[PDB]
Write a protein that binds this ligand. Structure first.
Ligand SMILES: O=C(O)c1cnn(-c2ncc(OCc3cccc(OC(F)(F)F)c3)cn2)c1
Ligand SMILES: [Mn+2]
Length: 326
């Protein structure tokens, strides 16, 4: 580009994995004393979690490790910003990817394959995808770009849909509220969410989520599949951002003034052998889940679709409290 955020976004978009092009990116999943990079790594600080605020039972029920096993970080100069590397129990990411791909995209919610009205939804998305695999044209699941849950934009009023509120998925609600509680938002309520589905060449340009405090509540950002490069900038659009990786299962929480910062995803990184899954996903969802659990079993035919999809995709979930938002 021409200004410093656009320069870095283009840099990272055109960057070569596996070379020193990325030695400037923070990896919160690396074991260091905030070194090795220059300016980025030096900003990394521990952030304290409200460990007593999420019981063991409730973490487990959510598919999470016990909050006391979590690590969490901020960045000097970015108030309200918390980064938590994958706190999910092994296998449990598969549940949330399944829900995003198969259930949440189901028609009561709104997706990009129409604006807000309905197009003729011929041939259920999931069961086509199931039989695109069995038999050797662009999949209906491969075309999905975003999905709104809870609150849905109308695009003419430029505000949320009048008479179309859909109930917020209570498993994703429980998970979000456990994380938000441990970040010290024990009253948080999940009410509006967006699911973003990226291919390996998909990007997200420089943007802010909202422009107003006085109604701003915390926003949580989940990630699954391939890693992305995340750029976190400032209130004005040409302040140079800080680059960081989002690996499968990482969670970012934005509150306070962080909620207003310009951010971006310039790059979804391919698996280093071009097609394949991150290591944390090499664990399957247990066969026997706890009876009191908010997660449900996953079927082989469902897993196969997810496993094939994610080889070249990143799934993003953002969840926020409402009581809006370019
Ligand atoms: O993948 C990541 O890491 C990432 C980081 N940010 N991000 C992101 N941020 C904002 C955002 O705005 C959604 C938005 C706003 C208003 C109305 C909307 O309704 C409609 F459905 F679009 F019509 C939607 C989407 N995605 C994703
Ligand atoms: Mn955003």
């Amino acid at each position: 580009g021409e200004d410093a955020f656009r320069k870095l976004f283009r840099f990272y978009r055109q960057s070569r994995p596996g070379t020193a092009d990325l030695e400037g990116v923070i990896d919160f999943s690396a074991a260091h004393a905030a070194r090795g990079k220059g300016p980025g790594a030096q900003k990394v600080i521990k952030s304290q979690l409200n460990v007593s605020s999420v019981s063991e039972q409730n973490a487990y029920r959510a598919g999470l490790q016990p909050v006391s096993k979590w690590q969490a970080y901020g960045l000097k100069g970015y108030p309200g910003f918390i980064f938590i590397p994958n706190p999910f129990l092994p296998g449990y990411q598969w549940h949330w990817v399944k829900q995003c791909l198969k259930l949440y995209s189901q028609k009561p919610n709104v997706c990009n394959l129409d604006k807000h009205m309905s197009k003729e939804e011929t041939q259920d998305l999931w069961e086509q995808s199931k039989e695109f695999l069995r038999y050797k044209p662009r999949s209906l699941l491969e075309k999905l770009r975003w999905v709104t849950v809870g609150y849905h934009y109308n695009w003419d009023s430029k505000k949320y849909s009048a008479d179309h509120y859909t109930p917020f998925p209570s498993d994703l609600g429980f998970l979000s509220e456990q994380v938000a509680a441990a970040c010290g938002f024990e009253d948080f309520r999940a009410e509006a969410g967006i699911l973003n589905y990226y291919r390996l060449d998909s990007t997200l340009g420089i943007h802010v989520d909202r422009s107003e405090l006085d109604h701003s509540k915390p926003l949580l950002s989940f990630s699954f599949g391939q890693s992305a490069i995340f750029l976190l900038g400032g209130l004005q659009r040409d302040e140079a951002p800080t680059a960081m990786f989002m690996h499968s299962g990482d969670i970012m929480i934005m509150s306070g003034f962080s909620r207003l910062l310009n951010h971006a995803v310039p790059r979804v990184l391919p698996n280093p052998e071009g097609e394949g899954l991150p290591h944390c996903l090499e664990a399957p969802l247990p066969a026997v889940l706890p009876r009191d659990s908010m997660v449900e079993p996953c079927s082989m035919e469902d897993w196969q679709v997810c496993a094939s999809y994610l080889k070249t995709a990143r799934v993003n979930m953002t969840v926020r409290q409402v009581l809006n938002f370019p």
